[PDB]
């Protein structure tokens, strides 16, 4: 429990009372930049698998339809 969790030393920690500080300091001021900062650090790892899922899904559909489509000669 608390008190026996870990041993730190000389780490001072300042803080403020909730009612004393603005609730949403610069919420959209920096929030947008940060959210955008975040998206750029993760978009290349996340997005291209789902892009090729979209291509495979469309391909399958069209292939499937085409497959079913009757060969005029048939």
């Amino acid at each position: 429990e608390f008190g026996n969790l870990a041993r730190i030393r000389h780490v001072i920690s300042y803080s403020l009372s909730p009612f004393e500080q603005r609730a949403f300091p610069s919420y959209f001021s920096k929030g947008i930049p940060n959210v955008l900062r975040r998206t750029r650090e993760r978009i290349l790892r996340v997005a291209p698998p789902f892009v090729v899922v979209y291509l495979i899904y469309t391909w399958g559909n069209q292939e499937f339809e085409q497959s079913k489509r009757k060969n005029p000669a048939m």
């Binding site: 429990e1 608390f2 008190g3 026996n4 969790l5 870990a6 041993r7 730190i8 030393r9 000389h10 780490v11 001072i12 920690s13 300042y14 803080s15 403020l16 009372s17 909730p18 009612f19 004393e20």
Partner: protein, 394 residues
């Protein structure tokens, strides 16, 4: 039956307050309305430094000469500095007033500024001043409560300034914050007021703070004990309700659970400092918060009485001695502008009842956001939401 605390003033504006008593020795001091609150972060250790340099060298006396003489007279020379006041006082045989006063005159004016050594002294001690955990806790209970104001900065100042200080700077602080209208010459004990007034005419005739509910946590788990101070905004020095708050402190009185009402010019810190093994810090806090709350909603005339009486036996008086009294004369002339007699204190104590005590306690303690300062193994010390929620009852 009771002393008079006869006080007068002079050309300079310096006040000359005295309270004759039959004790034989006297405590003659100079108070000055100059502390770390009047410093502007470029001279944050000027007052402390001055004191170290002061008492050592002067215009009429070289180096030890003053120290040497006071020893020669048999008097004890002391000085102290707070965030608002500076005091230089001598305890000496009354007959020596003639020199107890001339010496004090040199110490306030004509002083000669050693600077190198005192710098080292202050710095080195500060390197060790960290040993006084309690002082540390109380100089952060100040930093985190008065963030961004001149009341956050300590009396000693940061080592930085201490190293970076020069005679001229000091000279400024000396020439700026040592004005005659901001000075009280206080005497207590076997002194005559007319003789002291004549000596002051002969010598010495030449002379938005804000509380921010916040938290600082210095975690260092190698220390054996933890010191935690929790305070709210004290009314002030002049505020009348201070007395009903002192009675509240007398009701409260884990470990070393002291209580304090530190007052500055229309501000202050009212709260409790306790040292406990880490494992019990939270239980202490819970205990303590419950008590404040007890007074706020559930006082008892009996206990109030207990509190009024203890307060009654705290008032300082000729019995306490010259220094204690002088000190009170100097602070009373600097803060209130007058010496409040003990009969007025007794009247303000006896007008306090349980209803106005819980009203004034609800005014200050109840629901206001506290300042918390912890040092030591303070992991089980609760964070700000739990303390803030403990500042009221459902």
């Amino acid at each position: 039956s009771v002393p008079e605390t006869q006080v007068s003033i002079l050309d300079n504006g310096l006040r000359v307050a005295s309270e004759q008593s039959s004790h034989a020795t006297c405590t003659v001091g100079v108070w000055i309305d100059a502390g770390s609150r009047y410093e502007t972060e470029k001279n944050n250790g000027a007052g402390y430094f001055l004191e170290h340099l002061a008492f050592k060298g002067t215009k009429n006396r070289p180096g030890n000469a003053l120290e040497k003489e006071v020893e020669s007279i048999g008097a004890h020379l002391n000085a102290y500095s707070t965030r608002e006041h500076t005091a230089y006082l001598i305890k000496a045989l009354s007959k020596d007033l003639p020199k107890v006063v001339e010496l004090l005159a040199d110490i306030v004016q004509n002083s000669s500024l050693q600077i190198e050594k005192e710098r080292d002294v202050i710095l080195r001690e500060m390197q060790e001043n960290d040993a006084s955990m309690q002082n540390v806790v109380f100089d952060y209970l100040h930093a985190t409560a008065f963030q961004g104001t001149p009341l956050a900065q300590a009396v000693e100042g940061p080592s930085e300034n201490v190293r970076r200080l020069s005679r001229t700077d000091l000279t400024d602080y000396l020439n700026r914050h040592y004005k005659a209208p901001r000075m009280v010459l206080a005497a207590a004990g076997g002194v005559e007021h007319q003789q002291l007034l004549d000596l002051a005419q002969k010598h010495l005739s030449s002379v938005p703070c804000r509380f921010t509910g916040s938290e600082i946590r210095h975690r260092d788990d190698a220390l054996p004990l933890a010191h935690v101070a929790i305070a709210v905004e004290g009314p002030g020095w002049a505020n009348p309700d201070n007395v009903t708050l002192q009675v509240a402190n007398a009701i409260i009185g884990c470990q070393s659970f002291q209580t304090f009402n530190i007052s500055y010019s229309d501000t202050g810190l009212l709260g409790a400092h306790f040292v406990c093994d880490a494992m019990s810090i939270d239980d202490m806090v819970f205990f303590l918060q419950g008590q404040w709350m007890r007074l706020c909603t559930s006082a008892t005339e009996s206990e109030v009485t207990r509190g009024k009486n203890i307060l009654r036996n705290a008032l300082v008086s000729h019995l306490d001695g010259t220094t204690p009294v002088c000190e009170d004369i100097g602070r009373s002339l600097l803060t209130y502008g007058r010496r409040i007699p003990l009969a007025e204190w007794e009247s303000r104590i006896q007008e306090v009842d349980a209803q106005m005590l819980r009203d004034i306690c609800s005014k200050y303690f109840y629901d206001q956001c506290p300042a918390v300062a912890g040092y030591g193994p303070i992991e089980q010390l609760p964070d700000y939401n739990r303390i803030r929620s403990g500042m009221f009852w459902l």
